[PDB]
Amino acid sequence: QECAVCGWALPHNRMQALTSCECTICPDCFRQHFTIALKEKHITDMVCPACGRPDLTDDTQLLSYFSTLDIQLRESLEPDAYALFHKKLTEGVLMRDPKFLWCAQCSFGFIYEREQLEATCPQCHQTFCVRCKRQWEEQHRGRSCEDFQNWKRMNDPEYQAQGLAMYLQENGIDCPKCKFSYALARGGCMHFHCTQCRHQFCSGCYNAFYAKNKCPEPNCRVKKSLHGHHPRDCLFYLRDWTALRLQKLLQDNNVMFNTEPPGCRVIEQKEVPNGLRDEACGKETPAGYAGLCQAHYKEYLVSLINAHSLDPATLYEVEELETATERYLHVRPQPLAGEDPPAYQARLLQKLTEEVPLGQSIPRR
Amino acid sequence: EVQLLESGGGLVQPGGSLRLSCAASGFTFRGYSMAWVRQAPGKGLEWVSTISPIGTYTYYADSVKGRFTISRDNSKNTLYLQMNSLRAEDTAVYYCAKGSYSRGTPFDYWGQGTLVTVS
Amino acid sequence: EVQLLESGGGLVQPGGSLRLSCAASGFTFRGYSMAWVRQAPGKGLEWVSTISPIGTYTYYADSVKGRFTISRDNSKNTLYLQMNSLRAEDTAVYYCAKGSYSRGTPFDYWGQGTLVTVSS
Ligand SMILES: */C(=C\C(=O)OCC(=O)NC)CNC(=O)c1cc2c([nH]c1=O)CCCC2
Ligand SMILES: [Cl-]
Ligand SMILES: [Cl-]
Ligand SMILES: [Zn+2]
Ligand SMILES: [Zn+2]
Ligand SMILES: [Zn+2]
Ligand SMILES: [Zn+2]
Ligand SMILES: [Zn+2]
Ligand SMILES: [Zn+2]
Ligand SMILES: [Zn+2]
Ligand SMILES: [Zn+2]
């Protein structure tokens, strides 16, 4: 109806309704009164000029009042007047800067000096946890933010519908020289190119893909070719195994694996004109492959194998052990007198596992 | 990682129409609120509008409410700003912004911007 | 009017350290928060860190927590960013920014920018 200080008759939406005392103050009397309080009075004098309802000699309501009054003070005062309000509040009330919170839902900023761990945004009126800033719900009560954050990501239907594709995407590819983490699946292609440092490496074992005449490995027979050297438990080799034999290594060590979902939805980064377009794998998803394609299901099996440091050499036949001996020990094996095939096999196996460790830079877990 | 690419800015006469787009990638788009801000020539940054993660709620600055309409397409990871009845004060570089759950800021990423001129 | 001048950028070896500074003018320094944002190749702006008017509260993006320290000297109107254990992904223009309390604008002005590159 009219301003409670000067009587000027304005509509209700043309004045400032003080959220505490419910008084309608004209924009001019509001501004002039509060600044002169900053100018020559004290901060306990920041009460409504008409009424006086905020008791400033009372440490009960002092902080929640300035929290709400700060909003209207920001919109009505000048920049220098608003700065003295924070300086005097810091130097006379809090002995520190006020806790300013940004509502993640509507982008509003406000002072929050209450003891509760949940805060109500004065603008959108939604409540959120002060630490993790996610939307507050009853499930968060008595639970750490991580527990709560993991609980929502775990039961969001869109996340669960992706299936094992998320596990493949989440296990990142870290460039061994520039340390950039790409967080992509591998599929069937091991030769990785890093955009930042141009390093070429194997995404399964992080060994270098050497250019022509650059490989320094002794007894390398493809020095004039682009190539890398891989440990025996690198996906580069284990991708050639059938899913059945990969599962047998997991079963021999009591490691569980999915074969049904918990084309292929695994996201790949295809290069388009100026940019990368995330195009899904989309290849056939056979039964027993947990909703993935074959290459992505084998990658999933191998990362389980690598995470548990399972040794594929435990399943090698004699000819496999002989290949492994020449590849990694650089000696052609040969049976000795009195040895039957199992004894020969047991000897080659013991020497290989003692001298050649599993992938030393393979990402495990 | 995170990227926000704005497009749709240009020259337009007063009372005209213009629709900006912000293509988002590198994060779960549907799980964050998004916003439009703008910087008029020589002036300070100004907030324009914010939209909720799934679009239930929209918020607008006073000078643009009713003229501008914010919207999003989570199927495409794209954020839109439909600007109607442009004025001369609307000339500015426009930026889309990703809502942030980190303490200390309401947004943690801004695009490279798109220039709008109203002659 | 608001004026901000970043200084200290350069070429850094991996794991090296760098200290950026920012001289401010044209507003009451101790009245506002200050922030660092950065532009990586091909991107817009990424929030890095925010410091409260008198340094009570310091905030950091996840990717820099434990590696960067923000600080301010109000007696000189200067903002600092101490950057340790730099990686290639930290390569960016680093911008000084004057904080704001207005809705949806944690900062309203940002400076020229000083370029920091991390060799590989
Ligand atoms: C080999 C990729 C390839 O051969 O593409 C076709 C295919 O996957 N099967 C027919 C492995 N390389 C990568 O996956 C790769 C991905 C990215 C980057 N560099 C790479 O080498 C850098 C940019 C992020 C995606
Ligand atoms: Cl916050
Ligand atoms: Cl995310
Ligand atoms: Zn009045
Ligand atoms: Zn009153
Ligand atoms: Zn809110
Ligand atoms: Zn929380
Ligand atoms: Zn690299
Ligand atoms: Zn390999
Ligand atoms: Zn070689
Ligand atoms: Zn696939």
XYZ file of C-alpha atoms and ligand atoms in Angstrom:
639
model
C 0.000 0.000 0.000
C 2.575 2.561 1.131
C 6.090 2.785 2.521
C 6.253 2.363 6.300
C 8.962 5.052 6.634
C 7.920 7.986 4.428
C 4.290 7.092 3.631
C 4.783 7.252 -0.155
C 1.912 5.293 -1.712
C 3.369 2.701 -4.101
C 2.139 -0.731 -5.222
C 3.376 -3.706 -3.228
C 5.709 -4.907 -6.000
C 7.369 -1.459 -6.103
C 8.651 -1.600 -2.497
C 10.879 -3.999 -0.562
C 9.076 -6.488 1.683
C 11.489 -7.196 4.537
C 11.358 -10.990 4.853
C 11.771 -10.718 8.651
C 9.281 -8.087 9.858
C 7.015 -7.984 6.768
C 7.369 -4.198 6.408
C 7.076 -2.460 3.032
C 9.887 0.084 2.631
C 10.357 2.306 -0.394
C 13.572 1.635 -2.355
C 14.997 5.010 -1.314
C 14.352 4.913 2.441
C 15.570 1.304 2.432
C 18.871 2.293 0.839
C 19.605 5.544 2.677
C 18.883 4.076 6.119
C 21.075 1.001 5.785
C 24.088 2.833 4.311
C 24.188 5.524 7.008
C 24.163 2.636 9.478
C 27.292 1.374 7.736
C 28.625 4.927 7.383
C 28.561 6.194 10.976
C 26.625 3.663 13.089
C 27.339 0.001 13.919
C 26.146 -3.250 12.376
C 23.789 -3.955 15.290
C 21.879 -0.900 14.000
C 20.781 -2.731 10.810
C 17.210 -3.200 11.922
C 14.099 -2.215 10.011
C 13.804 1.596 10.243
C 10.042 1.569 10.812
C 9.692 -1.289 13.282
C 12.861 -2.477 15.012
C 11.828 -6.158 15.206
C 15.266 -7.811 14.680
C 16.819 -7.912 18.149
C 20.510 -7.207 17.505
C 21.466 -7.476 21.199
C 20.729 -11.193 20.867
C 23.104 -13.823 19.503
C 20.115 -16.188 18.803
C 18.968 -14.801 15.442
C 21.886 -12.560 14.506
C 23.460 -14.716 11.779
C 20.293 -15.996 10.088
C 19.106 -12.371 9.900
C 22.223 -11.046 8.161
C 22.075 -14.063 5.833
C 18.645 -13.017 4.562
C 19.257 -9.260 4.785
C 22.416 -9.679 2.690
C 20.229 -10.570 -0.305
C 18.178 -7.370 -0.290
C 21.248 -5.335 0.692
C 23.053 -6.595 -2.417
C 20.195 -5.625 -4.742
C 19.604 -2.166 -3.234
C 22.994 -0.847 -2.078
C 25.892 0.469 -4.137
C 29.124 -1.521 -4.571
C 31.069 0.390 -1.911
C 28.150 0.204 0.529
C 27.840 -3.550 -0.021
C 31.578 -3.949 0.626
C 31.414 -2.250 4.028
C 28.606 -4.660 4.937
C 30.903 -7.624 4.351
C 33.879 -5.923 6.018
C 31.897 -5.019 9.143
C 30.206 -8.432 9.222
C 33.633 -10.065 8.982
C 35.320 -7.770 11.507
C 32.468 -7.407 13.993
C 30.499 -10.669 13.928
C 32.269 -13.618 12.312
C 36.015 -12.859 12.698
C 36.299 -14.375 9.200
C 34.769 -14.307 5.755
C 31.146 -15.478 5.604
C 30.383 -18.913 4.190
C 29.010 -18.203 0.704
C 27.165 -21.089 -0.965
C 26.281 -21.514 -4.644
C 23.053 -23.409 -5.339
C 23.894 -25.980 -7.998
C 20.250 -26.137 -9.109
C 19.467 -22.470 -9.848
C 22.933 -20.785 -9.620
C 21.927 -18.489 -6.733
C 24.563 -17.466 -4.188
C 23.821 -16.896 -0.511
C 25.369 -16.790 2.949
C 24.758 -19.933 5.022
C 25.977 -19.866 8.637
C 23.741 -22.579 10.124
C 25.034 -25.780 11.718
C 22.910 -28.179 9.649
C 24.570 -30.179 6.887
C 21.678 -29.466 4.489
C 20.988 -25.965 3.179
C 17.824 -24.489 1.675
C 18.471 -22.202 -1.292
C 16.558 -18.932 -0.703
C 15.763 -18.709 -4.432
C 14.665 -22.148 -5.657
C 13.810 -23.398 -2.125
C 15.422 -26.789 -2.780
C 17.658 -28.318 -0.122
C 21.137 -29.697 -0.798
C 24.032 -31.187 1.148
C 26.557 -28.488 2.016
C 29.609 -30.678 1.339
C 28.751 -32.549 -1.869
C 26.135 -29.980 -3.075
C 23.937 -32.759 -4.500
C 20.191 -32.619 -3.909
C 19.359 -33.604 -0.338
C 17.259 -36.711 0.296
C 16.520 -38.886 3.313
C 18.980 -41.526 2.069
C 21.867 -39.098 2.663
C 21.021 -38.934 6.382
C 23.716 -40.672 8.405
C 25.688 -41.466 5.241
C 28.902 -40.029 3.848
C 28.683 -38.055 0.611
C 30.668 -40.758 -1.201
C 28.242 -43.411 0.057
C 25.386 -41.218 -1.168
C 27.061 -40.356 -4.483
C 27.880 -44.019 -5.137
C 24.342 -45.013 -4.124
C 22.673 -42.739 -6.683
C 25.066 -43.541 -9.527
C 24.555 -47.224 -8.713
C 20.738 -47.163 -9.056
C 20.260 -44.558 -11.798
C 18.481 -46.509 -14.567
C 20.311 -44.855 -17.469
C 23.649 -45.806 -15.906
C 22.546 -49.396 -15.275
C 21.105 -49.754 -18.785
C 24.603 -49.237 -20.213
C 25.707 -52.491 -18.576
C 29.367 -53.466 -18.766
C 30.055 -50.662 -21.268
C 30.497 -48.297 -18.309
C 33.059 -50.565 -16.638
C 35.029 -50.683 -19.896
C 34.829 -46.911 -20.360
C 35.697 -46.171 -16.718
C 38.955 -48.154 -16.750
C 41.094 -45.446 -18.288
C 43.960 -45.435 -20.753
C 46.817 -43.335 -19.349
C 49.538 -42.276 -21.776
C 52.791 -43.499 -20.163
C 54.748 -40.359 -21.113
C 52.250 -37.459 -20.946
C 49.967 -38.876 -18.186
C 46.735 -37.814 -19.926
C 43.927 -40.224 -19.007
C 41.514 -40.874 -21.867
C 38.919 -43.164 -20.212
C 37.990 -45.192 -23.285
C 37.497 -48.844 -24.037
C 40.138 -50.663 -26.067
C 38.162 -53.028 -28.281
C 40.448 -54.925 -30.625
C 42.936 -52.173 -31.483
C 45.991 -52.049 -29.211
C 48.058 -49.429 -31.077
C 47.226 -46.154 -29.309
C 48.106 -42.645 -30.493
C 48.096 -39.826 -27.943
C 46.852 -36.461 -29.184
C 48.881 -34.368 -26.738
C 52.359 -35.899 -26.993
C 52.087 -38.057 -30.164
C 53.394 -41.059 -28.204
C 52.507 -44.429 -29.712
C 52.038 -47.214 -27.175
C 50.065 -50.379 -26.510
C 46.890 -49.723 -24.540
C 47.095 -53.215 -23.022
C 50.602 -53.117 -21.567
C 51.777 -49.482 -22.073
C 54.887 -50.599 -23.971
C 56.148 -48.371 -26.764
C 55.207 -48.890 -30.401
C 58.610 -48.296 -31.976
C 59.028 -46.754 -35.413
C 61.296 -48.266 -38.061
C 64.795 -49.043 -36.730
C 63.980 -47.543 -33.316
C 63.324 -50.622 -31.165
C 66.309 -51.257 -28.823
C 65.226 -54.722 -27.657
C 67.944 -57.359 -28.156
C 67.269 -60.145 -30.661
C 64.323 -58.242 -32.157
C 63.559 -59.688 -35.590
C 61.204 -56.950 -36.841
C 63.393 -53.906 -36.154
C 62.634 -52.491 -39.618
C 58.871 -52.598 -38.935
C 56.474 -50.659 -36.743
C 55.820 -52.937 -33.782
C 55.706 -53.253 -30.022
C 56.749 -55.864 -27.477
C 54.118 -57.229 -25.121
C 54.157 -59.384 -21.983
C 52.374 -62.708 -22.198
C 49.331 -61.470 -20.237
C 48.743 -58.365 -22.386
C 45.410 -58.080 -24.187
C 47.459 -57.938 -27.406
C 47.986 -61.690 -26.990
C 44.993 -62.672 -24.851
C 42.580 -61.197 -27.421
C 43.535 -64.155 -29.647
C 42.290 -66.595 -27.002
C 38.734 -67.823 -27.229
C 36.285 -66.589 -24.625
C 36.127 -70.177 -23.352
C 39.846 -70.420 -22.556
C 39.840 -66.943 -20.998
C 36.941 -68.064 -18.799
C 38.824 -71.246 -17.878
C 41.724 -69.209 -16.493
C 39.207 -67.180 -14.484
C 37.454 -70.332 -13.252
C 40.726 -71.989 -12.208
C 41.248 -69.039 -9.830
C 37.626 -68.651 -8.635
C 37.148 -65.261 -10.303
C 33.543 -64.611 -11.259
C 32.561 -63.110 -14.602
C 29.344 -62.065 -16.295
C 28.002 -63.751 -19.408
C 24.512 -62.204 -19.398
C 23.780 -58.464 -19.103
C 23.804 -57.354 -15.426
C 24.433 -53.635 -31.036
C 27.273 -53.187 -28.557
C 26.703 -50.051 -26.473
C 30.421 -49.453 -25.836
C 31.135 -45.845 -26.780
C 33.978 -45.170 -29.220
C 35.489 -41.840 -30.275
C 35.192 -41.626 -34.062
C 36.857 -38.659 -35.765
C 34.560 -36.378 -37.785
C 35.241 -33.023 -39.534
C 36.638 -30.908 -36.681
C 35.968 -32.956 -33.546
C 35.379 -36.438 -32.184
C 31.892 -37.953 -32.434
C 31.044 -40.548 -29.775
C 29.618 -43.367 -31.901
C 28.619 -46.569 -30.125
C 30.319 -49.847 -31.029
C 27.101 -51.347 -32.370
C 28.540 -54.715 -33.379
C 26.820 -58.072 -32.826
C 26.298 -59.039 -29.178
C 26.451 -62.859 -29.021
C 24.724 -64.814 -26.289
C 26.996 -65.470 -23.335
C 28.998 -62.271 -23.961
C 27.188 -60.108 -21.365
C 25.611 -57.820 -23.957
C 28.944 -56.708 -25.453
C 30.544 -57.519 -28.787
C 33.277 -60.158 -28.959
C 36.294 -57.846 -28.753
C 34.797 -55.834 -25.894
C 33.756 -58.991 -24.041
C 37.288 -60.366 -24.356
C 38.692 -57.032 -23.160
C 36.375 -57.344 -20.154
C 37.647 -60.869 -19.463
C 41.303 -59.841 -19.824
C 40.957 -56.872 -17.465
C 39.504 -59.279 -14.907
C 42.493 -61.522 -15.648
C 44.926 -58.613 -15.354
C 43.235 -57.164 -12.256
C 43.874 -60.471 -10.464
C 47.343 -60.963 -12.028
C 46.358 -64.375 -13.369
C 49.158 -66.010 -15.355
C 48.101 -67.442 -18.743
C 51.277 -69.566 -18.702
C 49.518 -71.869 -16.212
C 47.486 -73.241 -19.153
C 50.268 -73.386 -21.768
C 50.848 -76.639 -23.597
C 54.405 -77.661 -24.488
C 54.509 -75.810 -27.811
C 53.189 -72.648 -26.148
C 55.895 -72.876 -23.468
C 58.535 -73.332 -26.176
C 57.292 -70.256 -28.055
C 57.305 -68.274 -24.799
C 60.863 -69.393 -24.016
C 62.240 -68.186 -27.353
C 60.215 -64.958 -27.256
C 61.094 -63.909 -23.702
C 64.256 -65.837 -22.761
C 65.811 -65.789 -26.272
C 66.887 -69.450 -26.091
C 65.464 -72.377 -28.035
C 64.346 -74.871 -25.371
C 65.372 -78.496 -25.623
C 64.292 -81.550 -23.602
C 66.842 -83.332 -21.420
C 67.522 -87.005 -20.803
C 64.867 -88.854 -18.818
C 62.164 -86.194 -19.258
C 58.645 -87.111 -20.328
C 56.363 -84.390 -21.796
C 54.959 -83.309 -18.392
C 58.459 -82.981 -16.906
C 59.629 -80.937 -19.897
C 56.477 -78.826 -19.544
C 56.979 -78.334 -15.800
C 60.601 -77.257 -16.289
C 59.883 -74.719 -19.034
C 56.984 -73.334 -16.980
C 59.025 -72.926 -13.786
C 61.913 -71.187 -15.561
C 59.594 -68.825 -17.453
C 57.593 -67.777 -14.385
C 60.802 -67.270 -12.376
C 62.676 -65.176 -14.968
C 59.942 -63.267 -16.833
C 57.372 -61.413 -14.693
C 53.858 -60.612 -15.803
C 53.114 -57.222 -17.354
C 55.009 -54.698 -15.244
C 52.993 -51.690 -16.471
C 49.691 -53.440 -17.280
C 46.798 -51.523 -15.648
C 45.369 -53.847 -13.001
C 41.977 -53.108 -11.404
C 37.165 -34.178 -21.307
C 34.542 -31.446 -20.866
C 33.725 -29.351 -23.923
C 30.949 -26.858 -24.667
C 30.614 -25.501 -28.207
C 28.290 -22.570 -28.841
C 26.845 -21.767 -32.256
C 24.105 -19.547 -33.656
C 25.367 -16.023 -33.013
C 25.503 -13.333 -35.654
C 23.977 -10.092 -36.893
C 20.236 -9.528 -36.517
C 17.977 -6.482 -36.616
C 15.970 -5.335 -33.575
C 12.786 -7.294 -33.044
C 14.436 -10.274 -34.725
C 14.810 -13.902 -33.721
C 17.831 -16.066 -32.975
C 18.393 -19.548 -31.548
C 21.730 -20.428 -29.953
C 22.978 -23.983 -29.452
C 25.523 -25.451 -27.031
C 26.772 -28.941 -27.895
C 28.094 -30.691 -24.779
C 30.426 -33.662 -24.386
C 32.837 -35.120 -21.860
C 30.330 -35.466 -19.013
C 26.940 -36.938 -18.146
C 24.841 -34.115 -19.585
C 21.526 -35.162 -18.019
C 22.926 -34.977 -14.482
C 23.759 -31.259 -14.400
C 21.945 -27.972 -14.651
C 23.047 -25.746 -17.528
C 23.067 -21.992 -18.027
C 23.539 -19.108 -20.443
C 25.571 -16.023 -19.528
C 26.669 -13.052 -21.607
C 29.155 -10.169 -21.609
C 28.074 -6.949 -23.297
C 30.896 -4.836 -24.808
C 32.933 -3.277 -22.013
C 30.502 -4.509 -19.338
C 30.678 -7.210 -16.697
C 29.404 -10.749 -17.113
C 25.631 -11.122 -16.746
C 23.604 -14.246 -15.990
C 20.776 -14.936 -18.443
C 19.068 -18.229 -17.618
C 19.488 -21.593 -15.882
C 17.715 -24.892 -16.616
C 17.428 -27.932 -14.351
C 19.084 -31.288 -15.209
C 15.983 -32.853 -16.803
C 14.324 -29.508 -17.570
C 11.607 -29.429 -14.898
C 12.545 -25.907 -13.775
C 13.714 -22.838 -15.682
C 15.068 -19.567 -14.302
C 15.595 -16.257 -16.070
C 16.997 -12.808 -15.486
C 14.328 -10.114 -15.326
C 15.395 -8.281 -18.496
C 15.052 -11.434 -20.628
C 12.188 -13.433 -19.066
C 9.376 -14.034 -21.535
C 11.564 -12.964 -24.459
C 14.127 -15.769 -24.074
C 13.326 -19.464 -23.670
C 15.923 -21.952 -22.454
C 15.525 -25.649 -23.227
C 17.611 -28.798 -23.459
C 17.687 -32.120 -25.322
C 19.407 -34.752 -23.180
C 19.014 -37.225 -26.052
C 21.441 -35.027 -28.014
C 23.462 -33.517 -25.120
C 22.494 -30.072 -26.421
C 21.351 -26.884 -24.681
C 19.277 -24.250 -26.491
C 18.465 -20.562 -26.004
C 15.599 -19.279 -28.169
C 15.979 -15.482 -28.249
C 12.900 -13.598 -29.462
C 12.351 -9.857 -29.991
C 16.025 -8.940 -29.749
C 17.032 -5.495 -28.495
C 20.201 -3.431 -28.773
C 21.150 -4.228 -25.172
C 21.244 -7.929 -26.114
C 24.445 -7.543 -28.160
C 27.073 -9.515 -26.245
C 29.226 -12.615 -26.337
C 27.007 -15.472 -25.150
C 28.421 -18.428 -23.192
C 26.830 -21.684 -22.118
C 27.882 -22.908 -18.678
C 27.876 -26.304 -16.986
C 26.429 -26.499 -13.494
C 28.940 -27.597 -10.883
C 28.699 -29.662 -7.708
C 32.121 -28.441 -6.550
C 32.274 -26.134 -3.544
C 33.124 -22.536 -4.411
C 31.380 -21.979 -7.757
C 27.974 -22.502 -9.403
C 29.648 -23.399 -12.727
C 32.951 -25.096 -13.498
C 33.034 -24.869 -17.320
C 32.195 -22.197 -19.895
C 32.271 -22.477 -23.672
C 34.406 -20.336 -25.942
C 31.393 -18.140 -26.682
C 29.326 -16.909 -29.609
C 29.044 -13.258 -30.649
C 25.606 -11.687 -31.121
C 25.084 -8.250 -32.688
C 21.723 -6.471 -32.809
C 21.902 -3.474 -35.158
C 37.040 0.514 -14.087
C 38.179 -3.039 -13.355
C 41.723 -3.807 -14.507
C 43.515 -7.147 -14.112
C 47.018 -8.069 -15.298
C 48.275 -11.641 -15.066
C 51.990 -12.373 -14.962
C 54.270 -15.388 -14.640
C 53.388 -17.699 -17.547
C 56.030 -19.599 -19.442
C 57.301 -22.959 -20.638
C 57.487 -25.580 -17.880
C 59.041 -29.036 -17.826
C 56.824 -31.888 -16.559
C 56.535 -31.968 -12.786
C 57.977 -28.464 -12.518
C 56.618 -25.557 -10.499
C 55.323 -22.142 -11.521
C 53.915 -19.145 -9.656
C 51.453 -16.811 -11.355
C 50.566 -13.368 -10.049
C 47.811 -10.904 -10.888
C 47.871 -7.163 -10.207
C 44.376 -5.727 -9.756
C 43.001 -2.187 -9.825
C 39.772 -0.258 -10.238
C 37.814 -1.757 -7.327
C 38.167 -2.363 -3.603
C 40.271 -5.528 -3.642
C 39.451 -6.788 -0.139
C 35.713 -6.589 -0.868
C 35.525 -9.495 -3.325
C 36.521 -13.077 -3.872
C 39.081 -13.743 -6.596
C 39.319 -16.689 -8.966
C 41.599 -18.348 -11.509
C 40.159 -19.849 -14.701
C 42.020 -21.351 -17.628
C 41.588 -21.967 -21.359
C 43.011 -25.256 -22.633
C 43.661 -25.646 -26.377
C 40.341 -25.733 -28.212
C 38.186 -25.163 -25.107
C 36.504 -22.250 -23.352
C 37.045 -21.640 -19.633
C 37.602 -24.126 -16.813
C 37.277 -22.968 -13.218
C 40.520 -23.586 -11.313
C 40.296 -22.044 -7.849
C 38.554 -19.373 -5.766
C 39.719 -17.474 -2.673
C 37.447 -15.578 -0.273
C 37.858 -11.814 0.362
C 40.417 -12.172 3.180
C 41.602 -15.701 2.373
C 39.424 -17.565 4.885
C 38.121 -20.056 2.310
C 40.031 -21.481 -0.652
C 38.368 -23.731 -3.229
C 39.876 -25.849 -6.005
C 38.745 -27.876 -8.974
C 39.202 -31.604 -8.387
C 41.981 -31.977 -10.969
C 44.207 -29.441 -9.155
C 43.519 -30.107 -5.455
C 46.749 -30.801 -3.601
C 48.846 -29.384 -6.468
C 47.753 -25.737 -6.675
C 47.669 -23.133 -3.909
C 45.720 -19.902 -4.338
C 46.595 -16.904 -2.179
C 46.156 -13.141 -2.033
C 47.976 -10.136 -0.584
C 45.272 -7.525 -0.007
C 47.862 -4.909 0.968
C 49.149 -5.064 -2.635
C 45.919 -5.906 -4.540
C 47.626 -9.014 -5.911
C 46.421 -12.579 -6.470
C 48.744 -15.587 -6.620
C 48.535 -19.116 -7.988
C 51.263 -21.526 -6.888
C 51.310 -24.436 -9.358
C 53.210 -27.612 -8.463
C 53.643 -31.003 -10.156
C 52.533 -29.584 -13.496
C 51.353 -32.033 -16.165
C 50.757 -31.659 -19.897
C 47.012 -31.352 -19.257
C 47.679 -28.166 -17.233
C 48.700 -26.382 -20.462
C 46.358 -23.403 -20.810
C 45.974 -19.666 -20.730
C 45.501 -18.799 -17.061
C 43.135 -15.905 -16.316
C 42.778 -13.709 -13.256
C 39.125 -13.013 -12.415
C 37.310 -10.616 -10.076
C 34.679 -12.423 -8.024
C 31.043 -11.415 -7.748
C 28.092 -12.225 -5.507
C 25.457 -11.838 -8.239
C 23.477 -14.920 -9.216
C 25.065 -17.110 -11.868
C 28.204 -14.926 -12.032
C 30.944 -16.139 -9.664
C 33.148 -13.622 -11.490
C 32.207 -10.674 -13.696
C 35.586 -9.628 -15.142
C 38.638 -11.628 -16.166
C 42.002 -10.422 -17.375
C 44.225 -10.704 -20.419
C 45.638 -14.141 -19.580
C 49.148 -15.535 -19.201
C 50.028 -18.653 -21.196
C 51.506 -21.703 -19.443
C 52.751 -24.657 -21.498
C 53.949 -27.955 -20.046
C 56.388 -29.802 -22.282
C 55.875 -33.513 -22.851
C 43.074 -48.464 -32.833
C 41.891 -47.666 -33.387
C 41.357 -48.265 -34.666
O 42.003 -49.061 -35.327
O 40.040 -47.858 -35.129
C 39.134 -48.797 -35.686
C 38.752 -49.830 -34.648
O 38.772 -49.546 -33.458
N 38.404 -51.041 -35.091
C 38.052 -51.288 -36.478
C 43.312 -48.108 -31.362
N 43.406 -46.672 -31.143
C 42.448 -46.020 -30.489
O 41.430 -46.579 -30.120
C 42.616 -44.563 -30.193
C 41.530 -43.820 -29.749
C 41.704 -42.472 -29.463
C 43.047 -41.852 -29.643
N 44.080 -42.591 -30.067
C 43.938 -43.895 -30.348
O 44.922 -44.552 -30.746
C 43.275 -40.388 -29.342
C 41.953 -39.638 -29.223
C 40.993 -40.382 -28.308
C 40.521 -41.661 -28.984
Cl 29.443 -23.462 -2.992
Cl 30.325 -37.027 -15.076
Zn 10.018 5.628 1.948
Zn 9.594 -3.580 10.294
Zn 18.491 -22.665 -5.835
Zn 26.853 -34.915 0.712
Zn 50.703 -38.472 -24.250
Zn 50.762 -54.826 -25.232
Zn 61.476 -54.873 -31.421
Zn 31.689 -53.732 -28.800
